[PDB]
Design a protein around this ligand. Sequence first.
Ligand SMILES: CCCCCCC#Cc1ccccc1/C=C/C(=O)O
Ligand SMILES: [Fe+2]
Length: 647
Amino acid sequence: GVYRVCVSTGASIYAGSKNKVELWLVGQHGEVELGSCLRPTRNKEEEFKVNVSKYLGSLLFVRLRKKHFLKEDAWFCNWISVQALGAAEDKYWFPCYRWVVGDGVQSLPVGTGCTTVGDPQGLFQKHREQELEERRKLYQWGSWKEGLILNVAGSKLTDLPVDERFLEDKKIDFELKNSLNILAPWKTLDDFNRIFWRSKLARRVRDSWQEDSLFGYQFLNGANPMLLRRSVQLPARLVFPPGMEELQAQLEKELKAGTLFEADFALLDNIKANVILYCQQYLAAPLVMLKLQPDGKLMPMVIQLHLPKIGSSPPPLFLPTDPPMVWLLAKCWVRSSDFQVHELNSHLLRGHLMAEVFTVATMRCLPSIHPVFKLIVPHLRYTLEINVRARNGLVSDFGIFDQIMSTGGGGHVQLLQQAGAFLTYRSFCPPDDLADRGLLGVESSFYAQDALRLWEIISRYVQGIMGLYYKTDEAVRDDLELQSWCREITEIGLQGAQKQGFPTSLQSVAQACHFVTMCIFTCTGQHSSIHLGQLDWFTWVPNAPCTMRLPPPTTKDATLETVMATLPNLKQSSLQMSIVWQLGRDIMVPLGQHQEEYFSGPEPRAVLEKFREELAIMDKEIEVRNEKLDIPYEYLRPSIVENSVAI
Ligand SMILES: CCCCCCC#Cc1ccccc1/C=C/C(=O)O
Ligand SMILES: [Fe+2]
């Protein structure tokens, strides 16, 4: 029959090629040779009619060979579509979206997608098994540091598969005034103003960072809402020095009313503090007890800076009533500890490292033709590149972290190791996490609200696509590839995460959907909610000290002098700004807005379109409620929630 074959080439600087490409149309009933059909032009679609006097039937693949003359010259193929003109059948979609290197022959299956069980005739069996074999050879596990969840093999960017590298245009675009004031005073809090300020919220932070309300507000809607939780009982670490009966009563009252909250940084205990230029840096594992007030404010009640040691008197408990500098100092310690835990655990580990696990596991276990692969890939874009770059300058030995963070120098890795034990399945699912932390219902928490709504929207999207390939729980149980995928993640990538609540197999449609939703959310909502706020809360050093120069107080006689001596110096404060500012000044793909089409059918596309509709409505509604908000919570607005962990 007569077909309109169309080939799409990438837009990146090197997507084009000077080599001719041969095409073959292979259907269920025979195939044909089209020969050298074109010479790939960057950012161009090449269409041409061809008449084959043979009956192919339904097309299964499109074979291609890039014949090179003297030099090989790579080519980035987006896709190939062949439309049978005249016959009333659908346009055959052959998704590629990858680099074609070498004179080797490749086959692109039609984008309908299917599971081994969903392909009884085994038409794509040979292909998927060999694609996976090649996948496993290209995407291997590794370990940047012992004791952490696994990452992608190698240590340099060049060790990543060609398809994982930034497209040239993004690579080039992605890649002191303070030193003038190098002879400027450093005696008072106001001196911190020499930094520079960059946004509406940041300025607010600079203007009211000493506010107990703003302080406690951050536990809910700030850059790190992953720590706070409703107190079921008083923390066992919260032991009282003599004479603290009054406070203890106020605590009991709030507990009984169920408005007592806690933010415990015990994770930081026993972690090696940095030594920058032979000077000792300091860390603290504080505990903050707060009360949710009827007017909607979360206010700090007490701050304990040290964990009580068994066999010795309890450490002091700081109160809002203590001298200004004493209380202010205790808060700075909490702000500093949050910065460390935020960056290492909430951001790096829970966001970047988790995503990488899902990425590698996916590339190793799910074939391009697989439904789940098509659902997930968009959300894995550029994760390996960014993470590799992080381990080659940010968290690497002698890197940026080691240069300015109090956890840098070794402790950061200990924290990352110790933190693995807390990577529980439930903590990655808002409905579950928010419930366990008693945040469900707390109307002051825009994070919890937006997190829940966004989760539901993604859940429906996942269900909608999964529903078209798994009509029964039995269908998911029998999916060997899906099962191996689940294991590659849980048992391998996460190193026995089954003990932390992760599934070792998916036994139902509802369970598989939940798992895919968990992955998709982690790579988008989870990361965005934690990444986006950095520029707003971490640019004003006092609100997030990268390091501390004096150990935590054990008495209540701190002076402004004590506060300044503890807080980062000019150089450090400046270095903090640079790192945060540059790493946040954001090109990008909004959640659900990926252009590449992996599915062929009209239904898969309808589900995606609904997903987009809902996200748009959520975005608009958030924008609105935010206009009537004191401090707008924007970290979960789909318009800015990224489609993958790519920054
Ligand atoms: C690949 C990003 C890894 C993020 C987690 C490790 C870190 C860090 C860091 C510390 C202090 C200031 C800024 C950064 C990173 C900022 C950013 O990624 O936007
Ligand atoms: Fe990030």
